[PDB]
Design a protein around this nucleic acid. Structure first.
Ligand SMILES: [Mg+2]
Ligand SMILES: [Mg+2]
Ligand SMILES: [Mg+2]
Ligand SMILES: [Mg+2]
Ligand SMILES: [Mg+2]
Ligand SMILES: [Mg+2]
Ligand SMILES: [Mg+2]
Ligand SMILES: [Mg+2]
Ligand SMILES: [Mg+2]
Ligand SMILES: [Mg+2]
Ligand SMILES: [Mg+2]
Ligand SMILES: [Mg+2]
Ligand SMILES: [Mg+2]
Ligand SMILES: [Mg+2]
Ligand SMILES: [Mg+2]
Ligand SMILES: [Mg+2]
Ligand SMILES: [Mg+2]
Ligand SMILES: [Mg+2]
Ligand SMILES: [Mg+2]
Ligand SMILES: [Mg+2]
Ligand SMILES: [Mg+2]
Ligand SMILES: [Mg+2]
Ligand SMILES: [Mg+2]
Ligand SMILES: [Mg+2]
Ligand SMILES: [Mg+2]
Ligand SMILES: [Mg+2]
Ligand SMILES: [Mg+2]
Ligand SMILES: [Mg+2]
Ligand SMILES: [Mg+2]
Ligand SMILES: [Mg+2]
Lengths: 234, 144, 142, 51, 126, 186, 103
RNA sequence: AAAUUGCCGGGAGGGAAGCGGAUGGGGGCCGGCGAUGCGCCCCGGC
RNA sequence: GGCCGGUACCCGCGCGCCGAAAGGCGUGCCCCUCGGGGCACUGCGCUGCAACGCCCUGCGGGCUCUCCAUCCGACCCGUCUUGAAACACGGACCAAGGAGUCUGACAUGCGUGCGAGUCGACGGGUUCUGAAACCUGGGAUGCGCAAGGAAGCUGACGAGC
RNA sequence: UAGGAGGGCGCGGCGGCCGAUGCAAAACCCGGGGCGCGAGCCCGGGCGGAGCGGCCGUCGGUGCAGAUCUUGGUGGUAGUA
C-alpha cells in the first residue's frame, strides 16, 4: 500500500538520522571526557598549589618578622537549625530569600556585605561557616540535586550539568565544585542551579540550639567547624 | 434539579453551611429594603446612588403611544434596498425608501454611507442625517 | 458507518447496549463490551465492534464441532447490514486455521492492529471447542 | 509533512549509584579520580618503601 | 486459570474503619461516619482514639481489587455474560450473581469449566 | 515541615478540557492535542487554549470589524476561534478566506457570495498545520452588556459603572447621589 | 438586602397563594372551543364560518395609525350608499355599526 | 427487625465497663485454603 | 553488622581459547623502567540473580471473624464558648417519621439554539395510544438594535499613541 | 473549625438498555468469605414464598445520634415504695 510504504520510508529516514546522531554523540562524548579529565587535573593541581602557597607566605612573613593575614573566606555554608514555627515575619522573608525554607537545609552563600548583614538578622536560626574542599565536593556528590526546569534532578551523572549549565562554561561536577569553592564569576548561576541541600539530622547529636556558638550553642559562625559539622550532617 | 443542589453536599455538616457563631435566623436585616436610610445606608448610597428623592415633574396619565418614535440610523438604509432595485440605478438615479413602510419614524445619522445616491423619505430627520445624505448626493422627502 | 469511526466512538463510548459495566463509576469500575465482533471484549476504541470500519470476529460456531467462524467486516458495504460481514467456517487444524487468520487480518493489511489478539481469541476458542468435546483432563492451575 | 521525529523513548529515573564508594560510578562522574588515587597510592609506596 | 498477577498484595490496614462510638450505642451502626464535632477527640486525632481514614491508607494501584485468588472479580448473571471472559481468565474471576437459580448456575459452571474461567461459586447452592 | 503556601501547589485554575460535551468539539480537541504535541506551532497552542473557553470568552466577531482587520492582507487566512456574524453596515467586502467555529447563515452567505472561502477548523488544520499565512483574531470581550456593570462601585466618585436599575426613567436612581440639587453628585 | 443587586420589588405580601391561577386546563380549553366552533358551523351551515363581514378601518393612536385592521361594522352611510338597508345588513351577514363616523 | 428477657454451651472478673495499636492463647471458619503440569522423545493407533 | 531492593536500559552475557571456578590470556603506543602502571582502536546482537530446603486434606496454613489475657494509649458525646470531661445544658434504650424546599423578579458563572436579531409564551389548523407532538402568525409582542434631558426637544459628521 | 469547590456511595420514581425469578424473588438474621482509604458493594449460609435488580440519561417529599424532637415499644428502677 502506498500509505504504508510511505510510512516505512519516513521511518527508515528517521532511523538513519538517529544512528548518525548517536555516532556523533559517541565521538563528542569521547572527546568531552578527555576535556573533563584535563579540567579535573588542573583543578586538583591549583587547589594543591593554593594550599601550599598559603603555608609558604605564612612562614615567609614570620621569618621576615611580621605576620601574614589569611584572606578571609569568600563562601559560607549556612544550614538552618530551628523549626518553622513561631518565627518573626521578617525572619520568614529573609529565610525565603536565603532559600532555607525547611529545617536542616544547607545552602552555599557568597560573602558580601549585603549577605552577611542579612545573616546577622536571622543568626539565631542558622549555623554557618567556611566549608573546605572535602565538604564542598562530598556535599555536591553525595547530596547533589539540580534545579532543572524547576524540577529537582539527582546529579548522578555529568549530563545534567550540560543542560542546567554549560552556557556558563561548566561541563563537569568538578567544574561545578571548583567554581563554587573558589567563588567564581558564574557562581550566581552555578548556585541558583543547585537545590538547597537536604541534610541528615546531626549524627552524634547537637549542642543546645538556643545559644550562639560562642555561648555554647550552635547558631552563628563556627568559622571552620562547619567542617566538623557537615561530616555529621552527612 | 435536586441532585445538584449544594445542600445535599452539606448533609452531615451540623450547620448546613450558615455558620456556628452567627447562625441563620429569620430576618436579621429586616424584610426587604428596610433600613434604606439607616443601616443599609452604605449599600444604597454605594451601589444605588440616586434611589431616595423626587426629581422631575409629574405627567398625569402618560400614554406610551404619545412618546413613540422608532429610529433608524442612516447606516441601515441600504439594507432596506433589495439588490435588484439597487442594480436598477445609475449615477444619477437613486432608490426611494419610505422608512415608515419599515416601521421607523426618525432617521438618525450614525455611520458611513456609500457614494451611492439614496432618496430617503421619512417623518423626521436630524441635522447630521441630512448632512450625510446630501453629501452622498441623495435627497430627502418629508411625509406623514 | 456513514459517519466516521471516530465519531461513532465519541457517540457510543458512554452508554451502548453491548456494554456491561459494574462496580460503579469509581476506581472499582469494571467495563466489558459483549458484542460479537470484539476480540478481547474490552470496551475501547481499538477493539470496539461498533466504532470501527474494520473488525475481526472469531466465534465458536452454531451446533457443530471444531468449526470456528472467522468474519471480517467489508469496508465498503457498511450501509447494507445483511451484507456487511464476510464469514468463513473453518474446521481445519489449528496451524492451518491460524495461517488463514494471519492471511485475513495481518498479511493483507486489512487490520494489523489485531494480528495478535485475533490469534489469541483463536487459541481460546479452539481449545474451548476441544474441551467441549473431550471434557476436563487438565486442571491447568500450575 | 510537518510533525517532528516521534519520540517513543521512555527515560526513567535511573538508580542511584553511591558516588563515593562505587568506583564504577565515581569514574563516570570524575574521570580523573583514578589518577588522583593512583598518584597518592604510588606516593605512599615510595614514602613507606624508603623506611 | 493461573493468575497473571506477579506482584505481592500488601495491605496497609486490614481492620475495619468502624464508626466512633458504635460500641457504646446500639442504634449507631458500624458504618463509618466522620465525627463533625467541635470537641471530638476522634476528629482532633488524639493518640488513643479511633483512627480516621485518610487517603494515605490507599492500596497499590496494580494490586487493588484482587481477592486472595489474585483475580479481579466480575459478577455474571448468565452464560452469555460469562462467555466474555475467555481472554481475561488470567486476571478476572467470574462470580455467579446471588439471585440466579441453581438450574442456571449449573449451566454457568459447566460453561466456565470448559472456557477455563476461574469461579468462586462453583460449589454454591449444591 | 516546609514553608510553602498551600504546599506550593498551583492555586490558580484554567480549563484543561472544555466543559461542553459536544462531540465535534472534543474531536477538535483531540486533533489539536496532536498538533500542539507533535508540531510545536504556537499558533496551534493558542487555538487549543482557546477551544478550552466559554462562550463569553469567545464573543462574535462581525464582518465590519473582520474587513477592517483584513483590508489588504488577502493572502493570509483569518482564524477566529468563535463566531462570525454579518453586518448590513458594510457594502463591499473582499473575497476573503476565514476559519471559525460558526457562521450565521447570513454571514456565510455574505462571504460565499463575496467569493471567499468559509472554513472550519478541520479544513484549516490541513492548509495551515503550523499556521502559515494566518491571521489570528479574537472578538471584543468587554463588549457584552454585563461587562458594563463591573468595575468600581456605581456610586463612588470617578467611576462610570452602570447601576442595576429595573427601568430607566426619572424615578429610578436620579435623585440623591446623582445631582447637587438632592444631596450630592455621587 | 445585600450585595449589589437590582432593588427587590416583589408584590408577594398579600395572600397570593389564594389567587394563583394555574393553566392546566389550557389544552381542554382549546378542545372545548374547537368543539364549540365545529357545532356552530354545523348549525349555521352554509353561512361562512368567519361570521359577518367587517370594515377596513385605521387604528387609533400615533403608534398604530398607519396599520389597517378590522372594524365592528360599516357605518349607516356605507350601508346606504351600497344599496344594503340598515335593518337588513345583519340579516345578510353584514355587520352594522351605528356609532362610527366617516371623515 | 431492634431495644428487652429465659434456657442451653463457652469466656472473664481485688472500688467501673466499653474503645484504639501490638501480637499471644483459645474458638468459629475458609480447599480458587495450596500444584501435580510443561516440553522432547518410543510405540499404537486416531 | 541492620533495613530495602533483585533487574527489558545502569550494570551483565554471548560472539575465542585456558580454567569446575574467582579469573588469566593479545597488539601498539606513553611511564617510571624490578613490581609493574596509564592510554589506545570498537562492532554486532541478547538482556526479569541464584542454591537447598519445610508442608500439601494434616495435631496443617492464616483469618480482616469471635472471646480472653498482658503491655502502651485512653475522660462523654452534641453544643453556645476565648476556654467542656466539666460541679454548663440535652441525652435511659430501640424502631419508624424528622429539618435550606417550591414559586415571581434579578444577578454573575457555565451549556445549548440562533445571532442584529431572537423569542410561537396568548391564539388557530392539525393530532386515531396522547392534556403529548407538529405546523402557523410578528410588517414592528417583550427584550435588543441609541443616548442625553426635569420637560419642550435634540439625537452619535466615521481615531490616534 | 467556620466556610467553598470537585469526584463518588446510597434511596424512590420516569424514558431507554441489559437481565435474575417457585431448581426460590423481595425483606430480614449470621462467630461466613471477600473488595474498597471511605460512603458502601459482592458472594455463602438460613428463614422467607413473590416478585427484583445492574447501567446511561433525568427527576425528587433522598441519607439521622441528638431538637426537655413526634408516635410506638421496651428496660433498670423493682418483686422494691
Ligand atoms: Mg547513635
Ligand atoms: Mg540537648
Ligand atoms: Mg466543615
Ligand atoms: Mg449532629
Ligand atoms: Mg453556606
Ligand atoms: Mg447552629
Ligand atoms: Mg469559636
Ligand atoms: Mg447572618
Ligand atoms: Mg455574635
Ligand atoms: Mg437613626
Ligand atoms: Mg474547640
Ligand atoms: Mg511534609
Ligand atoms: Mg463629589
Ligand atoms: Mg399574610
Ligand atoms: Mg434481640
Ligand atoms: Mg452462663
Ligand atoms: Mg482492647
Ligand atoms: Mg487476633
Ligand atoms: Mg449566644
Ligand atoms: Mg463564659
Ligand atoms: Mg468543675
Ligand atoms: Mg445546672
Ligand atoms: Mg441553655
Ligand atoms: Mg436529662
Ligand atoms: Mg429514618
Ligand atoms: Mg421583534
Ligand atoms: Mg493599539
Ligand atoms: Mg425531608
Ligand atoms: Mg414521591
Ligand atoms: Mg435518632
Amino acid at each position: 500500500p502506498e500509505k504504508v510504504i510511505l510510512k516505512r520510508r519516513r521511518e527508515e529516514v528517521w532511523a538513519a538520522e538517529k544512528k548518525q546522531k548517536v555516532a556523533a554523540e559517541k565521538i563528542k562524548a569521547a572527546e568531552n571526557t578527555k576535556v573533563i579529565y584535563a579540567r579535573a587535573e588542573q583543578y586538583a593541581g591549583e587547589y594543591e598549589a593554593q594550599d601550599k602557597e598559603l603555608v609558604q607566605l605564612k612562614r615567609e612573613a614570620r621569618m621576615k618578622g611580621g605576620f601574614y593575614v589569611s584572606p578571609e573566606a569568600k563562601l559560607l555554608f549556612v544550614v538552618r537549625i530551628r523549626g518553622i514555627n513561631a518565627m518573626h515575619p521578617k525572619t520568614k522573608k529573609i529565610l525565603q530569600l536565603l532559600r532555607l525554607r525547611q529545617i536542616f537545609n544547607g545552602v552555599f552563600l557568597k560573602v558580601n556585605k549585603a549577605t552577611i548583614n542579612m545573616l546577622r538578622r536571622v543568626e539565631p536560626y542558622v549555623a554557618y561557616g567556611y566549608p573546605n574542599l572535602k565538604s564542598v565536593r562530598e556535599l555536591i556528590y553525595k547530596r547533589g540535586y539540580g534545579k532543572l526546569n524547576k524540577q529537582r534532578i539527582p546529579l548522578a551523572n555529568n549530563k545534567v550539568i550540560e543542560e542546567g549549565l554549560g552556557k556558563h562554561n561548566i561541563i563537569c561536577i568538578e567544574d561545578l565544585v571548583h567554581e563554587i569553592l573558589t567563588v567564581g564569576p558564574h557562581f550566581k548561576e552555578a548556585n541558583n542551579f543547585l537545590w538547597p541541600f537536604k541534610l541528615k539530622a546531626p549524627l552524634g547529636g547537637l549542642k543546645k540550639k538556643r545559644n550562639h556558638y560562642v555561648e555554647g550553642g550552635d547558631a552563628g559562625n563556627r568559622e571552620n567547624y562547619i567542617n566538623q559539622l557537615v561530616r555529621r550532617m552527612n | 434539579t435536586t441532585r445538584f443542589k449544594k445542600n445535599r453536599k452539606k448533609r452531615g455538616h451540623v450547620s448546613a453551611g450558615h455558620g456556628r457563631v452567627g447562625k441563620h435566623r429569620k430576618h436579621p436585616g429586616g424584610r426587604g429594603n428596610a433600613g434604606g436610610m439607616h443601616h443599609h445606608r452604605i449599600l444604597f448610597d454605594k451601589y444605588h446612588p440616586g434611589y431616595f428623592g423626587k426629581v422631575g415633574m409629574r405627567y398625569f396619565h402618560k400614554l406610551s403611544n404619545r412618546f413613540y418614535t422608532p429610529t433608524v440610523n442612516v447606516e441601515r438604509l441600504w439594507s432596506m434596498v433589495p439588490s435588484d432595485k439597487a442594480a436598477e440605478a445609475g449615477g444619477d438615479k437613486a432608490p426611494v425608501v419610505d422608512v415608515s413602510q419599515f416601521g421607523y419614524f426618525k432617521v438618525l445619522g450614525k455611520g458611513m454611507l456609500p457614494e451611492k445616491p439614496i432618496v430617503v423619505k421619512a417623518k423626521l430627520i436630524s441635522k447630521i442625517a441630512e448632512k450625510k445624505i446630501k453629501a452622498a448626493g441623495g435627497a430627502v422627502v418629508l411625509v406623514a | 458507518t456513514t459517519v466516521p469511526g471516530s465519531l461513532v466512538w465519541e457517540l457510543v463510548k458512554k452508554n451502548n447496549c453491548f456494554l456491561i459495566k459494574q462496580f460503579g463509576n469509581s476506581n472499582a469500575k469494571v467495563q466489558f463490551s459483549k458484542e460479537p465482533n470484539n476480540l478481547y471484549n474490552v470496551h475501547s476504541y481499538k477493539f470496539s465492534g461498533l466504532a470501527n470500519s474494520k473488525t475481526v470476529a472469531v466465534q465458536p460456531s452454531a451446533g457443530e464441532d471444531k468449526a470456528v467462524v472467522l468474519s471480517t467486516t467489508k469496508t465498503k458495504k457498511q450501509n447494507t447490514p445483511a451484507k456487511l460481514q464476510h464469514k468463513t467456517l473453518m474446521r481445519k487444524e489449528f496451524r492451518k486455521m491460524a495461517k488463514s487468520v494471519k492471511n485475513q487480518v495481518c498479511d493483507n493489511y486489512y487490520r494489523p492492529d489485531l494480528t495478535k489478539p485475533a490469534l489469541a481469541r483463536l487459541s481460546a476458542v479452539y481449545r474451548s471447542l476441544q474441551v467441549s468435546k473431550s471434557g476436563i483432563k487438565k486442571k491447568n492451575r500450575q | 509533512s510537518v510533525v517532528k521525529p516521534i519520540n517513543k523513548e521512555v527515560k526513567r529515573r535511573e538508580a542511584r549509584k553511591n558516588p563515593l564508594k562505587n568506583a564504577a560510578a565515581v569514574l563516570k562522574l570524575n574521570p580523573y579520580f583514578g589518577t588522583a588515587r593512583r598518584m597518592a597510592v604510588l606516593a605512599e609506596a615510595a614514602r613507606v618503601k624508603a623506611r | 486459570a493461573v493468575p497473571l498477577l506477579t506482584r505481592k498484595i500488601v495491605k496497609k490496614r486490614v481492620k475495619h474503619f468502624k464508626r466512633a462510638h458504635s460500641d457504646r450505642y446500639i442504634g449507631l451502626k458500624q458504618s463509618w461516619r466522620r465525627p463533625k464535632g467541635i470537641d471530638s477527640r476522634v476528629r482532633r486525632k488524639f493518640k488513643g482514639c479511633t483512627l480516621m481514614p485518610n487517603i494515605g491508607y490507599g492500596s497499590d494501584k496494580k494490586t487493588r481489587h484482587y481477592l486472595p485468588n489474585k483475580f479481579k472479580k466480575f459478577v455474571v448473571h448468565n452464560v452469555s455474560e460469562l462467555e466474555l471472559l475467555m481472554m481475561h481468565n488470567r486476571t478476572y474471576c467470574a462470580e455467579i450473581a446471588h439471585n440466579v437459580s441453581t438450574k442456571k448456575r449449573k449451566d454457568i459452571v459447566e460453561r466456565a469449566a470448559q472456557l477455563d474461567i476461574v469461579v468462586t461459586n462453583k460449589l454454591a447452592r449444591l | 515541615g516546609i514553608d510553602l503556601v498551600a504546599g506550593g501547589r498551583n492555586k490558580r485554575t484554567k480549563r484543561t478540557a472544555p466543559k461542553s460535551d459536544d462531540v465535534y468539539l472534543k474531536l477538535l480537541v483531540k486533533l489539536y492535542r496532536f498538533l500542539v504535541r507533535r508540531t510545536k506551532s504556537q499558533f496551534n497552542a493558542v487555538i487549543l487554549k482557546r477551544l478550552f473557553m466559554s462562550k463569553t470568552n469567545r464573543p462574535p466577531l462581525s464582518m465590519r470589524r473582520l474587513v477592517r482587520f483584513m483590508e489588504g492582507k488577502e493572502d493570509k487566512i483569518a482564524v477566529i476561534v468563535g463566531t462570525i456574524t454579518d453586518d448590513q453596515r458594510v457594502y463591499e467586502i473582499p473575497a476573503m478566506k476565514v476559519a471559525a467555529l460558526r457562521f450565521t447563515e447570513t454571514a456565510r452567505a455574505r462571504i460565499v457570495n463575496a467569493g471567499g472561502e468559509c472554513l472550519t477548523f478541520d479544513q484549516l488544520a490541513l492548509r495551515a498545520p503550523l499556521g502559515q499565512n494566518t491571521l489570528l483574531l479574537r472578538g471584543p470581550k468587554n463588549a457584552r452588556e454585563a461587562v458594563r456593570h463591573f468595575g468600581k462601585a456605581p456610586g463612588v466618585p470617578h467611576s462610570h459603572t452602570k447601576p442595576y436599575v429595573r427601568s430607566k426613567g426619572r424615578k429610578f436612581e436620579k435623585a440623591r447621589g446623582r445631582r447637587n440639587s438632592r444631596g450630592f453628585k455621587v | 438586602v445585600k450585595h449589589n443587586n437590582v432593588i427587590p420589588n416583589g408584590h408577594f405580601k398579600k395572600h397570593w397563594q389564594n389567587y394563583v391561577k394555574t393553566w392546566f386546563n389550557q389544552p381542554a380549553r382549546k378542545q372545548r372551543r374547537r368543539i364549540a366552533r365545529q357545532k356552530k358551523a354545523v348549525k349555521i351551515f352554509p353561512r361562512p364560518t368567519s361570521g359577518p363581514l367587517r370594515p377596513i378601518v385605521q387604528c387609533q393612536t400615533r403608534k398604530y395609525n398607519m396599520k389597517a385592521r378590522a372594524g365592528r361594522g360599516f357605518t349607516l352611510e356605507e350601508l346606504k350608499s351600497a344599496g344594503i338597508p340598515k335593518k337588513l345588513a345583519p340579516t345578510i351577514g353584514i355587520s352594522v355599526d351605528h356609532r362610527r363616523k366617516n371623515r
